[PDB]
Amino acid sequence: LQRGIAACMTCGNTKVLRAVHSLLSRLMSIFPTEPSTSSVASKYEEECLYAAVGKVIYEGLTNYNPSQLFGTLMILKSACSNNPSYIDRLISVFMRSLQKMVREHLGTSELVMLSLELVKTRLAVMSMEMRKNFIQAILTSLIEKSPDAKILRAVVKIVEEWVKNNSNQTPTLREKSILLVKM
């Protein structure tokens, strides 16, 4: 089945990606591809073949939407199910599509943005180079020019969770206060 289910990962949507979500229950076990090399899986990887497509999917979405947008949503939700971390290389190319779709506003994009904010906010690893652009895009689109209220509520939720933790110090006072005052 590892050879066959990979075909569904190719974004033959036909409203089946919701059925591919069923495979999340399997990924809840180990998903050892991120914490170590991809070769640490034992005869269920051929999660190499799935991580490959999850990484390569950025091509169409960054080289230019709802179809590939939902494909990215579901594939990143499934991959990030158990292990919250993932390589910076894919972030550096995926977060561009976020702003590209944000500035395109002139319905599912709201849910795509919700899922993307959920998946991206788990870990912060940039060395204040692009993270600045991340916080700026947040405070300038999700707060200032957000047409729908659900995405504003979700960013309120994520910043609440940020200020809620106390242990590790992923957020900082500067961007925290900036977001709070913009809100």
Curated annotation (Swiss-Prot):
Subcellular location(s) of the protein: Nucleus
Function of the molecule: Adapter protein, which is found in various multiprotein chromatin complexes with histone acetyltransferase activity (HAT), which gives a specific tag for epigenetic transcription activation. Component of the NuA4 histone acetyltransferase complex which is responsible for acetylation of nucleosomal histones H4 and H2A. Plays a central role in MYC transcription activation, and also participates in cell transformation by MYC. Required for p53/TP53-, E2F1- and E2F4-mediated transcription activation.
Oligomer and partners: Interacts with MYC, E2F1 and E2F4 transcription factors. Interacts directly with p53/TP53. Interacts with GCN5L2. Component of various HAT complexes. Component of the PCAF complex, at least composed of TADA2L/ADA2, SUPT3H, TADA3L/ADA3, TAF5L/PAF65-beta, TAF6L/PAF65-alpha, TAF10/TAFII30, TAF12/TAFII20, TAF9/TAFII31 and TRRAP. Component of the TFTC-HAT complex, at least composed of TAF5L, TAF6L, TADA3L, SUPT3H/SPT3, TAF2/TAFII150, TAF4/TAFII135, TAF5/TAFII100, GCN5L2/GCN5, TAF10 and TRRAP.
Entry's free-text remark on domains: The PI3K/PI4K domain is required for the recruitment of HAT complexes, and the MYC-dependent transactivation. Although it is strongly related to the PI3/PI4-kinase family, it lacks the typical motifs that constitute the catalytic site of PI3/PI4-kinase proteins, and lacks such activity.
Family statement: Belongs to the PI3/PI4-kinase family. TRA1 subfamily.
Disease note: Developmental delay with or without dysmorphic facies and autism: An autosomal dominant neurodevelopmental disorder apparent from infancy or early childhood. Some patients present with intellectual disability and renal, cardiac, genitourinary systems, as well as structural brain abnormalities. In some cases, the phenotype is less severe, has no systemic involvement and is characterized by autism spectrum disorder and/or intellectual disability, sometimes associated with epilepsy. Affected individuals manifest variable dysmorphic features.
Name used for this protein in its record: Transformation/transcription domain-associated protein
Native organism: Homo sapiens (Human)
Full protein: residues contained: 2193 to 2399 of 3859
